[PDB]
């Protein structure tokens, strides 16, 4: 509309209405110029055997993008508590996005002193990739999302993508994308932008823990009418072979017939937080579970959803089977264990095999008068008819959705880092500053213009999500476990700022507190 | 549109699968867009 009028307002809050909760977040952003308005080809710079798994080919673009795909973007710690203590499940419904109060600044630097002024006629370009025609980078747990704390101003991350590569070289099948070749809306300082999005139907995330285990579903007072083989020999001696059968009952619950079995496993190596218990060797990469694709090895991370550890042992964690978050101010490389937060999937032990254990045993031969029965350990087990399992939990710091790859087939497309898998997830929102050239020469030149005015933009983003709730119906008599704050005195309030104004998140918070019968 | 009754397949303009340091009709590492070769219009055939 105009230079002196505001194109939007600040909306941050949650509205709890019945079975719906509506969250709204507003943040202030800053967008630089990336790559000097250039598309640039990029590839791994390394050589040798080590480079092999790390090889890539792709492009970086002048564009930035908006990422709201973490939960702490949309929920305060109190709202997340209010969610996870009272509800058995939740899921996103609608999405509403706004971009407003756009300001374009020009920077003239002379003799080491820089001046910043408004450029009132400059534009910023924005479009959403509604047709999912661009490579989709939002499901890779990247940085650059809206900050959890509403008072922080954040920088918009640069967009880039990878295409097919052989080592660091490309192939004829590799694709190049100009983002200028999409239609986009152009905004001066009075203009604003919005769009709305509709989540496709997904299952409720299961924010509850089971109060029964898959192997304990029987009535503890009654026998089965099934029999099992109790004895193959009468005793010590020669030629003692016999067949004896017993009823499965309360005394022996391990041999009873069951209708359902625990879910699939891919074994992880077990690491202790007590370092003297670990082996004195480097086994981080060498001893890691991995999968290979076209010759390259990828770590299995986090992998299939499995219980992090056995009951009573919390000092162990899967080598690359858990999500690990950094504490506030944690460095990038080779930080100690107290600098990171290792989450655990202990709640899913009821239906899921432990990550660091074998699935079970199988017979490896035929026993005979000349051959003893032999067994072997099942290190990995794929889906069997009759398996039941839980997905990975979601966290306040963790991702919300992922894009399901477009393929002939998939199974249980729920994404492995947690959250909601979608064939049409929330679309990517691309933004860049329109280049403003400096003064051209006075005689014509056919070369493209490499001289521009140094420029950046800033503004406000609001995002609104409607969430559907699934309320707890339980008949449990005794009280539940709840997520709660601790009363003990401390130098800081958790989930607040410190004396320097730095907001931190003390610990990762999962979703599973309330219980359900298995 | 091409109406042809030709049985055997046509010549088409196509990219080459062989690996290269650059994708044709893309930018290089410095951001320079180039056009590798001139491309004509005549591939499909018609009877004289």
């Amino acid at each position, epitope marked *: 509309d105009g230079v002196g009028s505001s194109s939007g307002n600040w909306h941050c809050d949650s509205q709890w209405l019945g079975d719906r909760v509506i969250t709204t977040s507003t943040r202030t952003w800053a967008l630089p110029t990336y790559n000097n308005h250039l598309y640039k080809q990029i590839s791994n710079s390394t050589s*040798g055997g080590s480079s092999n798994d790390n090889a890539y080919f792709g492009y970086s673009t002048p564009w930035g993008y908006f990422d709201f795909n973490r939960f702490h973007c949309h929920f305060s710690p109190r709202d997340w508590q209010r969610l996870i203590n009272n509800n058995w499940g939740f899921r996103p419904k609608r999405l509403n996005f706004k971009l407003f109060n756009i300001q374009v600044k020009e920077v003239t630097d002379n003799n080491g002193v820089k001046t910043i002024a408004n450029n009132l006629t400059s534009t910023v370009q924005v479009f959403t990739d509604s047709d999912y025609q661009l490579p989709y980078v939002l499901g890779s747990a990247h940085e650059g999302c809206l900050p959890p704390f509403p008072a922080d101003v954040f920088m918009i991350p640069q967009y880039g993508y990878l295409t097919l590569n052989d080592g660091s070289q490309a192939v004829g099948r590799s694709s190049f994308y100009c983002l200028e070749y999409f239609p986009s809306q152009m905004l001066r300082t009075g203009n604003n932008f919005q769009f709305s999005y509709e989540f496709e139907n997904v299952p409720f995330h299961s924010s509850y823990a089971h109060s029964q285990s898959l192997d304990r579903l029987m009535n503890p007072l009654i026998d089965q009418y099934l029999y099992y083989l109790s004895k193959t020999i009468n005793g010590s001696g020669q030629n003692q072979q016999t067949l004896k059968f017993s009823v499965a009952g309360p005394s022996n619950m391990a041999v009873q017939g069951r209708n359902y079995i625990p879910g699939p496993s891919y074994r992880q190596q077990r690491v202790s937080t007590t370092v003297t218990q670990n082996n004195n060797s480097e086994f981080a990469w060498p001893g890691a579970s991995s999968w290979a694709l076209n010759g390259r090895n990828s770590l299995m991370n986090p992998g299939p959803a499995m219980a992090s550890h056995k009951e009573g042992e919390d000092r162990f964690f899967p080598l690359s089977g858990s999500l690990i978050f950094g504490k506030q101010g944690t460095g990038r490389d080779n930080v100690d264990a107290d600098k990171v937060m290792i989450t655990n999937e202990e709640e899913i032990k009821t239906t899921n095999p432990v990550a660091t254990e074998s699935y079970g045993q199988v017979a490896t031969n035929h026993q005979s008068a000349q051959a003893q029965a032999q067994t072997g350990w099942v290190q990995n087990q794929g889906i069997l008819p009759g398996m039941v399992w839980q997905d990975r939990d979601v966290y306040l710091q963790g991702p919300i959705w992922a894009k399901i790859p477009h393929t002939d087939g998939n199974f249980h497309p729920s994404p492995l880092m947690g959250g909601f898998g979608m064939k049409h997830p929330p679309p990517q929102i691309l933004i860049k500053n329109t280049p403003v050239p400096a003064d051209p020469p006075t005689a014509f030149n056919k070369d493209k213009l490499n001289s521009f005015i140094t420029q950046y933009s800033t503004g406000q983003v609001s995002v609104e999500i409607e969430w559907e709730l699934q309320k707890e119906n339980s008949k449990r008599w005794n009280p539940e476990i709840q997520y709660t704050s601790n009363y003990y005195k401390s130098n800081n309030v958790e989930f607040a700022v410190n004396t320097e104004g730095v907001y931190s998140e003390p610990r990762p918070i999962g979703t599973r507190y309330l219980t359900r019968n298995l | 549109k091409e109406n042809s009754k030709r049985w055997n397949p046509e010549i088409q303009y196509t990219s080459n699968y062989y690996k290269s340091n650059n994708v044709e009709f893309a930018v290089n590492t410095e951001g320079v867009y180039s056009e590798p070769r001139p491309i004509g219009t005549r591939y499909l055939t018609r009877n004289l």
Partner: antibody
């Protein structure tokens, strides 16, 4: 089939600068990483530098950092090593090698040129 | 960087003998280990690359095994042509490093 030829070897006083050129006739030169390997007299060979198949990146061994520049011309199928501030230790036979695709070993080696740094 | 240690430094055997050379790595270099045979006045020639795999046009008597930090070069039915200096090199990371070398002697 694949031939690598090294030229420009010779004697130079210390602090002197020398340039080495490698010619490759037998293959697609732009698909491969190329290296420089030197073997001092009576010693095992030693890796000096490599350069990317398009020339975007390059690596050097610590001893020679800043004094040597590896360079690549894909149109002429030639590899160049630029040596500055030469030392007595530097004198060795210089080998031009091609790094194998995927495996990364030196599948092909040039005959090599002897380069002497003498007072 | 990574250090490569080759043993023994020198070895002497006779035609028909079985010779074994051991290479050790300071750090994990996976399967990226090569064995080079070198004769005076010539460049090193690759015999075995990527741990186990044999170079084409090389006799089947040369064999290689091992992964991670320990590798071994095995020669069965030794021949007069086989006497040379042998190097183990790691192509896993830069700077690429070579072993000290094992020299074989006529008996």
């Amino acid at each position: 089939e694949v031939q690598l030829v090294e030229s420009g070897g010779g004697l130079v006083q210390p602090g002197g600068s020398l340039r080495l050129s490698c010619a490759a006739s037998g293959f697609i030169f732009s698909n491969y990483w190329m290296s420089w390997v030197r073997q001092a007299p009576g010693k095992g060979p030693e890796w000096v530098a490599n350069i990317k198949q398009d020339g975007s990146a390059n690596h050097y061994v610590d001893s020679v950092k800043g004094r040597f520049t590896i360079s690549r011309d894909n149109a002429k199928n030639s590899l160049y090593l630029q040596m500055n501030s030469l030392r007595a230790e530097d004198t060795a036979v210089y080998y031009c090698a091609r790094e194998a695709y995927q495996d990364w070993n030196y599948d092909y080696w040039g005959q090599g040129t002897l380069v002497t740094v003498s007072s | 960087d990574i250090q490569m240690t080759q043993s023994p430094s020198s070895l002497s055997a006779s035609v028909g003998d079985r010779v074994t050379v051991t290479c050790r790595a300071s750090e994990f270099i996976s399967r990226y280990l090569n064995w080079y045979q070198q004769k005076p006045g010539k460049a090193p020639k690759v015999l075995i690359y990527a741990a186990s795999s044999l170079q084409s046009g090389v006799p089947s008597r040369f064999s290689g095994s091992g992964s991670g930090t320990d590798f071994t070069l095995t020669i069965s039915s030794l021949q007069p042509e086989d006497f040379a200096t042998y190097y183990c090199q790691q192509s896993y990371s830069t700077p690429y490093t070579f072993g000290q070398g094992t020299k074989l002697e006529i008996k």
